[model samples]
Target: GPLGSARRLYVGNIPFGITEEAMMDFFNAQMRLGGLTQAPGNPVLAVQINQDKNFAFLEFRSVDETTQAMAFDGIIFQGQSLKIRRPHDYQPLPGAHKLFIGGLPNYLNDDQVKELLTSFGPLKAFNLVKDSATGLSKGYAFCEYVDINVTDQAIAGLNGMQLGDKKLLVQRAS
Candidate 1:
């Protein structure tokens, strides 16, 4: 059910009077332009319209394709800007607690940072901020633990620990 549910995308603010065939064509073309490979079969598996509500649901071939399609939010379709989002039935995976970590040395790569955090508990998610132009770490990151309860202890254990010349700044993110 999770796999099936994640492949569905919510498309809102559709221009009135547009046919489903047209909608399919629009998205198929846009996805190709967005750099998604044009596989043999249509990436858009199906489309369902709700004319009364000016919205529709598009079923993509895979979760990755569905997620990538979200980048087209506010994209112009016909005369209206479409609102692309996850379907209401979509349930995200657990582990929402996140921590902000700062004062990291630029020399530390993503794997190094992950290794340090994994010492407390397995990570659910981790992202190291980096400079786009230079591809260098911004010396900060956000991470979440697989065991959410481990967050506080991780903060206590790692916070203010000296790494290189920098004292790690670990805290609940916002």
Candidate 2:
């Protein structure tokens, strides 16, 4: 679990070879270079490296440190530029628990969409995008989960899967 009261950040595109220890050293060094001192829980609280995804999660002691780290987004590390942002849990919006499903078949209606997505978990809501001009599908929709936690699992299984000759492009909805 994330450290209590800790702020978690998504650090994207980290070099696959860097270990959790190296990440700590890298961030600590960056903080010093920025003329910042470590706060309590100063060291990174936790690191979840997903090599296959080429991304990592870094947990910090406080929002201040997390804010400071955000400045490092796009900073070059081992010849790779990194991306940094807060996890969706930190955002305020109903759409935070939603995923954008693209490349859908025009024939699939709301019922079919619900059936497809429900394979992941009970849905909070589902929409089959439609056109205003003729009321036909716009070939995309949004899926909302009853449990926010299951959205990720749904995306994992649905992304790139075939759906009536179209491959789904499932991703976290902005």
Candidate 3:
């Protein structure tokens, strides 16, 4: 099951005390990171907080805005490292030996990004997500090490490493 539009993003690691206004303000700051704002259009259309207060979903005006918002993954918001993702884009194979990489700089091409990943070890598979219309990097990727044992070290070394606009998110595929 999925939301109606591809413009929604899943946001995690939110503090319990955050208010809707505060969440909107924080997300507005994220939109500003890529020079996006409501002045042009309503970048963030809605903010839905879960009853448990653990996470929320943010709806943007366009898929491109959703892609832009993913760049804010791992950003420190309210003293917590925020995790941003497109629910439809997540296709983690159950129990697969894989690591996910996100919040990549748009300027880094597939090969360029892989160069940094190769330092971890040889990969069984590698994919840098791209825009279907323009074929540009979508700021995320999946990398499976030839030896699954290497994934932990890769996550440790690569997680939170600054790329361009934001720090990278290196973790087990989920």
Candidate 4:
């Protein structure tokens, strides 16, 4: 039932709380595409989270099925419309060295930042610097890890940590 456009597939508009299990289940239920296939390094990656949780990646196991998904796009799930794109360019978030941490509480100090994230892995540069003229912390800061594993783990484990009474937004700083 696939259109000729189905060589690849991109299933987006995902819910954040939806784990890989939930995603896998959705594709499994689709008797049309013969289940799912994990691509390259990350078979799944978060695209965005605004308002409602939205967007993730899904690659089918066969080209024919992929084509099927392209035709299968715009499915109704939980009363929301989904999108499908073919041959999505799976690119790493550029360099792994950079990280952006925001939504910091004014009460938190530089040491607190190091203490919170350092447990994840070795620190390359933990900068909590302040402008000499202002004599105040920059409110948010950046950290570079000595190992890529740590960076990846930190982002997964701590992106939504409650701090300053708000879930912090952390990413690769792309």
Model 4, 66-98: lDDT tens digits are: 544555477766665777665434322335568
Best by TM-score: 1
Q: Model 1 Cα displacement at 43 (Å)?
A: 0.6
List per-prediction Cα lDDT, in the order shown.
0.86, 0.79, 0.79, 0.62
Each candidate's root-mean-square deviation in Å? 12.5, 9.8, 13.7, 14.4
State, as a TM-score between 0 and 1, how close model 4 is to the true structure: 0.43
| TM-score against native, each model | 0.56, 0.48, 0.47, 0.43
Q: Which of 2 and 4 is ahead in lDDT?
A: 2
Model 1, 1-174: lDDT tens digits are 554478888999999899888898888888887777446556887899999998999988877788788889999887798998776666555445689999999988999998999999998789999999999999999999866668999999999999998899999887
Taking the tens digit of each residue's C-alpha lDDT, what string does model 3 give over 1-174? 333557788889988778767787778776876685535655887788884858898977776677677778898887999887667554334347777899998778989989998997887699999999999888899989765658899988989988776999999887
Separately for all candidates shown, the number of backbone clashes (residues 3 or more apart, or on different chains) is: 0, 0, 0, 3
lDDT of 4: 0.62
By TM-score, the candidates rank as 1, 2, 3, 4
lDDT of 3 at 95: 44
